[PDB]
Amino acid sequence: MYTFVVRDENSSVYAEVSRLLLATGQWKRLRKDNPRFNLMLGERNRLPFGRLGHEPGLVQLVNYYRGADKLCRKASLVKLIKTSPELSESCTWFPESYVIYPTREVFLAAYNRRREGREGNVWIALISSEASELLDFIDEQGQVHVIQKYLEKPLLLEPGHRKFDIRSWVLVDHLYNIYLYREGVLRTSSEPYNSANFQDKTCHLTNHCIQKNYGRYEEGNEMFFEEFNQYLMDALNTTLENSILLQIKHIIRSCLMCIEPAISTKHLHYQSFQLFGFDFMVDEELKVWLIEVNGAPACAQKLYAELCQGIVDVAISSVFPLATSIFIKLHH
């Protein structure tokens, strides 16, 4: 009987994971600060990685990757893509990005190049068109912000002329296998998109929450993969796999392969897995873009059962065994 502790009570995902584990009859749950645990479903900030893998006769496994924040932090994610030769400035799936602190680095020199052809000069943090409009917005918060080329011509679903993003859930295991969940989610905007009034950011910001019209064309402003792929076939004469999913699988593989040397727990005394949520943006040319990597990601209600049961099969029972698949192994 393996033992596990629970130190992020706010985890929709691992809330399930705890529940499933107990119901196996081979997983008991200790108290937060009991060190004789096999598995730490840890906290989000200041998880004590220094204390793991020091319990003699205890193989310890934790559900986070020390270092993983370099990818899941907007300012750090830009820094990571600019400076790693594995990604380079000639990175064709990340939009232009600069880190500006509040008290322009080479941000101004790019905006000016845009005065040369009067090309689209919409950006984001929040969305403006004048640099002064935006720059005066990061110093009104006081914290580090990052501004990006806004994708002025995105892909709109009809009927609706509507925006959306794609969240892919990726699970990296103790062996650094990269597992993509087959189920994805399009988080769709019920408000028809238009590029005249940015300040009316309800058809521009596609967050399920910020959509406090909620539920018109598809339930919960969420379109799963079977539906989207159908529309793609009918509307565009293509498939989700070809037009979009390849590039996503390329981006996921490339991102995680970059940081592998910094975060791998191959020869380490404790081991990590971690579930990531990857957030993409498909433009009108059927091009996939990486927006944000989320290290503490929530799943869509319908898929919780399946995803959390797969975390246990692939990331947890792999290490602590007991008495086809829902993931796509991204190969390397």
Partner: protein
């Protein structure tokens, strides 16, 4: 590091004598005091417990004390009677009548200085005295009342030496007289204040173990004392034999006792064996471990699942895998880590000695400081007030000088001790 042993009264001297029989066998000393053994491990720490005489003979560092000559004559008759130094038989004649007051205040007072003289003689011989161990019951009158008088006086002369006792707790299942809860509560008050370490040998446990597990239908003191020698040999292995630990009484107290009053230890033994009949399969290291942590193997009738282990010390004897001993010991904690305080990290330590005890190829002695020992004091406190609320049998004590007040104080110090043990069973 010499130890000075003292046995007081009926019970104290009968288990005292078995101990010397049992360990004299292990150290290869015979009744004549002459060593006739195979290994040298047997002689390396022989001075901890034995003085070396001329003719290269070995004389136990043991003081024998009683208020009656009865048992003490018995001991001199018994198999190892002649090993004991004759000047160390210090006795009166009037007896103590199973009366704590007669032992502590009247009859015992007459004889105690005579005892303190033999003690001092033995202490002077000693290159570095670790301290003292005493054997006594808490339910009679000599070992109980005088026993704790000696302890109070020894602490005055040697305030920085360690005081270790083996204290047999009274039980209705094995009781000489109704006043044993009075004698035990007055003694426990003393023990809480003046000993570093006491091993709570419960006559209730020794009975249940003799009856249920060893299937003895009508257990004698000799069957109970067998169980007591086995434990006494186990919890002193690390003192009498060389190891990786090099253990002694003070280090034991430092590591076992987080708080000074909580020094009452649950002993345990595996495998439980009945006298004479030898069974022939050695145990697997996995069996020693599960058995030694079994409540059925505890010598203090407490459920360890009703409390939390503050600290644990386990001692394995025989030829076995220290690797397996390691895995089995880590295994029991990580499986039942609930029952060990989280706020004392790594509170379970283990030791191994190559030599097994006579007649076993593999054995495990267990020393627990569990907060469940309160169950024991609660039991004795209930019996005590069942009588005291009616001042029953008190005249036996008032007649020797004692005051009702002294009884209220002792009772109250004990109920306090139970409160203290409860404070940490929750922490």
């Amino acid at each position: 590091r010499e130890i000075v042993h003292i046995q007081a009264g009926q019970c104290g001297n009968q288990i005292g004598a078995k101990f010397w029989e049992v360990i004299s066998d292990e150290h290869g000393i015979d009744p004549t005091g002459s060593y006739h053994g195979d290994s040298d491990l047997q002689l390396e720490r022989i001075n901890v417990y034995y003085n070396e005489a001329t003719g290269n003979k070995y004389v136990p560092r043991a003081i024998l004390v009683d208020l009656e000559p009865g048992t003490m004559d018995s001991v001199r008759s018994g198999p190892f009677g002649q090993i004991f130094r004759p000047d160390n038989f210090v006795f009166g004649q009037s007896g103590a009548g199973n009366n704590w007051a007669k032992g502590h205040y009247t009859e015992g007072a007459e004889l105690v200085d005579s005892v303190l003289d033999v003690v001092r003689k033995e202490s002077e011989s000693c290159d570095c005295l670790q301290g003292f161990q005493l054997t006594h019951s808490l339910g009679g009158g000599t070992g109980s009342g005088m026993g704790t008088l000696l302890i109070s006086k020894i602490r005055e002369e040697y305030p920085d030496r360690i005081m270790n006792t083996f204290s047999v707790m009274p039980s209705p299942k094995v009781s000489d007289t109704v006043v044993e809860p009075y004698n035990a509560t007055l003694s426990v008050h003393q023990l809480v204040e003046n000993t570093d370490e006491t091993y709570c040998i419960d006559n209730e446990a020794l009975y249940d173990i003799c009856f249920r597990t060893l299937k003895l239908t009508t257990p004698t003191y000799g069957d109970l004392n067998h169980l007591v020698s086995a434990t006494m040999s186990g919890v002193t292995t690390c003192l009498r034999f060389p190891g990786q630990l090099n253990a002694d009484l003070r280090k034991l107290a430092v590591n076992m006792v987080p708080f000074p009053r909580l020094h009452f230890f649950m002993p345990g033994f595996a495998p439980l064996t009945s006298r004479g009949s030898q069974q022939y399969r050695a145990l697997t290291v996995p069996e020693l471990t599960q058995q030694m942590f079994d409540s059925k193997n505890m010598m203090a009738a407490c459920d360890p699942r009703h409390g939390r282990y503050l600290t644990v010390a386990a001692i394995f004897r025989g030829r076995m895998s220290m690797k397996e001993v390691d895995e089995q010991m880590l295994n029991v904690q990580n499986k039942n880590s609930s029952y060990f305080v989280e706020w004392i990290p790594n509170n379970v330590k283990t030791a191994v000695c190559d030599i097994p005890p006579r007649g076993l190829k593999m054995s495990a002695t267990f020393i627990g400081n569990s907060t469940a020992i309160q169950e024991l004091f609660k039991r004795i406190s209930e019996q005590f007030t069942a009588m005291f609320r009616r001042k029953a049998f008190l005249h036996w004590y008032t007649g020797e000088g004692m005051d009702e007040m002294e009884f209220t104080e002792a009772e109250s110090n004990m109920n306090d001790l139970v409160s203290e043990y409860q404070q940490y069973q929750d922490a």
